[model samples]
Target: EYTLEKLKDLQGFYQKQLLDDTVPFWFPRSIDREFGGYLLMRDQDGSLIDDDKAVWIQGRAAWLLSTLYNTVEQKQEWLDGAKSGIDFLNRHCFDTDGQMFFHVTRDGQPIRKRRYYFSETFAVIANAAYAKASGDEAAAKQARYLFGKCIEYSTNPGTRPAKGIGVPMIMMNTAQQLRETIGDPRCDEWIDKWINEIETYFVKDDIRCVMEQVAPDGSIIDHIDGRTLNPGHAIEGAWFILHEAKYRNNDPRLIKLGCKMLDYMWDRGWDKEHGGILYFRDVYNKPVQEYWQDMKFWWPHNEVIIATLLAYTITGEEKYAQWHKLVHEYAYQHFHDAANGEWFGYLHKDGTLAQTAKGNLFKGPFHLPRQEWYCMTLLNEYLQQS
Candidate 1:
């Protein structure tokens, strides 16, 4: 059980050191200063892995910097950086179908086009953050349009979009509620729509944990739809749901369910022997696909550390703090590469550095920076309460 003072001490360490170190470590340098758009794909050691640009990464980094610019008091550079990424995404990241393209070549050429919808969601988050920071109504409306599109595909029974779309709706719609509270009625329709959609389609209120995927008509896909125990995501979504519940003064049940979610998923997913969260476990089977089925990913550790600590912050429970410590001990021991700048994304079950790539088509500023920001935010707020 940590006192408030001890929690502050932990907050200072992450704010001053760990968060500061990782952001610059995995920075994107592929942006075109002269023409437009970003160069994308850095190597394992932060070198340019490829000149080709991935629209999803570009949108994600844009949103990441935009979020920091608005929230962090000392990070104006982040706003400018975000605008740059946004400009790049707007110019080069989209194709003729009014969809955000999947991948673009270094000089702004389209290579492949699948799942523009997912990329669109990232762009929605980025644009919304930028709009909130700059008070750009147009940008906010852009977010609304993208969000509507996301709902179109996500909820439509005919076609299937990416499964990760639910998490973003949980976030973006919640932000919409905040905008409404401040007397902006722009997203009013969307606010209710998304709330209803989330409750109706995404959250398995009966089970008190989220299902991984479902048919567009809100039917759970039993075979692949089992929750399969993703503790990191469950914990992250718990906090997201908690934030919404806090904002609305709506349901204490959400928080109650969130705590149970953290408990159940963590017990199932935490690696008891190796002391880190396992990457994946079976919903039913003993063996899983992918080579590093047993490996631990850096982002999951970051989530566990942040989620456990936040759970403690909200509940003032000793066990949550202990869970935080458990994840902390494991992450510090295994994930961080002392010789390298950022933690390795993939590690063996025995906790050896097996893969270390900073910026990829999928991995970017989202997870680590979000964890850092959320932890710092909660710590500051928690101290005020204490």
Candidate 2:
């Protein structure tokens, strides 16, 4: 059912969308020329809706821009965009405690700081990426500092309120990128540690589920917080594990474990009646307390798209390919806006658009464009193998 021609076409489609459509949609609009970072509150038509900047988006946009410049082409605009964000972040995003803020004004004044360390986590990757793009040792040093801070904060129960899957998932990804770009052996060590934490603490074979929260001792809690399952996040984490395994000479046990994670998550997340992945599901199949548990979010589908294709690419299995095609078809039809260059963030159960805004505090150029870039790269790699 799959052919090299179809694979070639898929590659072309994703590449064009990333370079021509999606990247163009963000630049000049999201880029804050006068201020140093990006303004992410944009509508479907790429019009600015708010002036406040989300701290995570600033780092995410910087990382995206720097990554594009480093990997895609020698575009000065991309490099400049990345630099602006890094400057903004270094100047104002961090507090006196060396932790980053969660939200800030357009002028880079801190608005609020969330309880979690995700802002610092994202800043870790952004500075590492910008350091790679600009060859700035200070930025690289800053990345190291933040990485250390995150480790301290993550491990210290006094600093961190609780341990969750998010920190490890994000650390695994950040470590990989930093390792590849910075060529640090410590990054590799960090990768191994986080992957081990994810395997030991979050992933459970008995329940066949990846839990969102676990006890500090890496045991599952019996309450609602412990019973929560986010299949999308688990699938995304699986690909990160697979990528690290691939980098380390493609370990069979790790690859099989990643594939198994994908299998368990896809079985739990995919809607049998509706066409998209659910936002939340309980491990025991009880009703979720969150009102938006069943809604289809844009990022989860993007993760599923990457996970399925990456699984297929690694295993050369027909079922993974079939799953990839199915998710791709559903996602493109439901999330993509023909008139707008980007995608709608939220969708109803029946694949109807639920939100009109394209970019918000939580959504930005990261997931969809990263999806396009990775899918394109994977398809091209698959073509070479074929």
Candidate 3:
């Protein structure tokens, strides 16, 4: 339904946001001039709020910088930034056991390590991208090793609990990144395995919803964790699947499955009365234990923006386009900070800014900048077709 002129304008906006606003906003502030990795704890103005670092931020920022250098433009600054993260992570973040620390001191001393392997997952992908950007076979080997260890730990569960959807979602992305970067045949094998795991365990047909947790046998656990639904996560995962399908010559079945997942999640997540996405919901209409269920978070809106637009691009459905615009308007009005340059991380149910700080342990430069990059990229594709 959008005119060519409007599409062009939107594309320009997103381009400027990514290159001029979001990326610039984080840079220099996030760059630890003395240290090797990024400092992600920042206030609204990108000032250093804390000196400590999260393991995931280092990996994510490394991946982003390397990806920019590999995909966008060959800036030495980007490569240097990425290398700093990779070096910091390799030297300080991991234990002798090969598991990554969840949190660390500014100088890379370990402060905490969570039970989850998300840190390791992110580290592997970061190394994969760094390997591509730097042409380092050693880094590529490191990525493959970490990925294999994750797979082994998943099956054996020496101390870990049953798998959650996050594992497969992250593995799906990490494998694809490694595959594209190094042309590893093993990455393809892992992608095939994880994608099937996502389909078999998380996505439920009878409930017409995606569950957050499931038993090893793929049955709902009937507990609070099992009954929980995170629409944003499902929507984001759907777009991941959709992107995989697009890469595979647009397989119709995968496309349809992605769209179906988006439809159900959007129906559940979108706040009809409030104009933003809800944080959490129960699949069976029971009260969600998460107190922030009604509140709006910045990341979900980012996912919906990508998902709806992706669905529109693939199917040319007017409804997807409409959904895209609906979310775009709401997100721009509430989440984006025109004066502050980045996005607010949280909002009340009525769309008021719930937090003033921009960067936290849970939020960082990845989602917002990535959202702009994706939107601009997709809009340019649509414009060319038009």
Could you tell me which 10 consecutive residues in candidate 3 have the lowest summed lDDT? Answer: 154-163
Residues 27-122, model 2: lDDT tens digits: 856788898899888899988878898999999999999999888887999999999999999999889986788999999888898877788878
Of the pair 2 and 3, which is ahead by TM-score?
Answer: 2
Preferred candidate (lDDT higher): 1 or 3: 3
User: Model 2: which ten-residue window has the lowest total lDDT?
Assistant: 154-163
Candidate 1 local lDDT, 199-224, one digit each (tens): 56655655554545556666655544
Steric clash pairs (candidate 2): none
Highest TM-score: which candidate?
2
> TM-score: which is higher, 1 or 3?
3
Native-to-model Cα distance after best TM-score fit, residue 32 in candidate 1, in Å: 4.0
What is the number of residue pairs that collide in model 2? 0
Question: Candidate 3 — which pairs collide?
Answer: none
For each candidate in the order shown, give its overall lDDT on alpha carbons: 0.67, 0.86, 0.85
Better structure of 1 and 2 per TM-score: 2
Q: Which regions of candidate 2 are displaced past 4 Å?
A: 157-162
Q: What range of 10 consecutive residues in model 1 has the weakest lDDT sum?
A: 177-186
Off by over 4 Å in 3: 156-162
